[PDB]
Design a protein. Sequence first.
Lengths: 278, 92, 13
Amino acid sequence: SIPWNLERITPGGSLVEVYLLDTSIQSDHREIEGRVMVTDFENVPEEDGTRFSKCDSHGTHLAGVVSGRDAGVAKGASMRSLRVLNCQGKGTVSGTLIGLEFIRKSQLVQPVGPLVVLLPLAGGYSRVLNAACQRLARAGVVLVTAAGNFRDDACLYSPASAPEVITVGATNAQDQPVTLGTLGTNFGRCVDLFAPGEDIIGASSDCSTCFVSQSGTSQAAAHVAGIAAMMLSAEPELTLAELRQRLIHFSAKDVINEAWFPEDQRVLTPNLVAALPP
Amino acid sequence: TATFHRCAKDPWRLPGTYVVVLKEETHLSQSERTARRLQAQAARRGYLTKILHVFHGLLPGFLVKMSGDLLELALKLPHVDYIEEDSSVFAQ
Amino acid sequence: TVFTSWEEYLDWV
C-alpha cells in the first residue's frame, strides 16, 4: 500500500511555498522535479577533513518527504531551497541567519501566499538564532524545526528552543521515540509534538528515480512541514496560534510510551503524534 | 549594557567570527556606520577586521571576522544589544 | 538499501 509513515499521519498544499534551509539538493530528481526551485543562495563552512554519502543526500530526501510525487506529504506544495549545510551536513549559525534574512527579503520583493520554513538542523542554544526565528515568525512566517537527535532536552539547542517555532521530535512505526545510534530524538517542554522519523523512505540523490530510507528529527520535522502546508492551503488565513492548535487537535494523543524519556521529562514532553485532518 | 555570548558546547564554537546584534530600531545606515567604526577603532589598535555581512530585515547588525580581543571595545559601540560568537549547526 | 525505482521499493516493502 503506502509507506507506514504516510499511513500514520493519514486518518495538496498548492497555496504554500516551503523554504528548505539545508544541504544542496538534486532538483531534477523525478520525485521533486519542477516542484522545487533552487535559489542562488549558498552560505556554508568549509568541510573538515575529507569525508562524505553525497553532498545533496540529506536535503534531497527531505524535499521528497515534504513534496515528493510518490512518497511526499504535500504533493502539490512548491519548495525553495537554500544551501546552509555543507557536504558533511554542517553549517553555521551566521549562515542560517543570513538564509532566514534572505527568505524575508525574497518575500518583500515578490510576495506570494503562506510561507513555511523548514529548519532540519540544530546547534547549541543560540540567542541570536532564536531571536531571528522569533522575528521571522512575527513577520507572519511559519517555522518548523527538528528537535535534535541528541536524546536530550530540546531547550538546550537552537532553533529547537526558539519561541514561535514548531519543534518536532521523532517517533517510529510503533509510535515510540526514535533511537539513533547511542542517542535519539530530543524531548522536553520545547518540543511541540512528534512525527514519523524512523525508517522514512524518500528521494535518494544517488539517481533520478532512486529512493532510500532515512531516520532523524529532520525527517519528522519534514512531515510536519508537509502537514502545515496542507492545513495552510485549506485554511490560508490561519494565524500561527490557530495552526498550532489545529496540529494539536488532529494529533494522535497519548500513544507514546513515556518511560523512554527521563523521569522528570515525561510530564514536560507532549504526548502527541502529528496527523492530517480527516 | 551589551553582553557577550558564546556556544556552551565547546567543540561547536567558531572563535574569531562574531555576530554583532544592534538594538531593535537600528536602521541599516546606522548598522553600516557602526561596522565601519569598529573597523576604524580596531585598526588604530593594530587589529585587522573583515565585515562579512550587514544584517537587516529581521535583526539589525553585522557579521565580523576579528580577534576576540576586541570584544570589550565592540560592546561599547553605539546601538549594540549583544554580541555572539559564531557556532556550528548540524543536519538532523 | 537504495531502490532504483518506486516500483522496486514497492516490490520490496
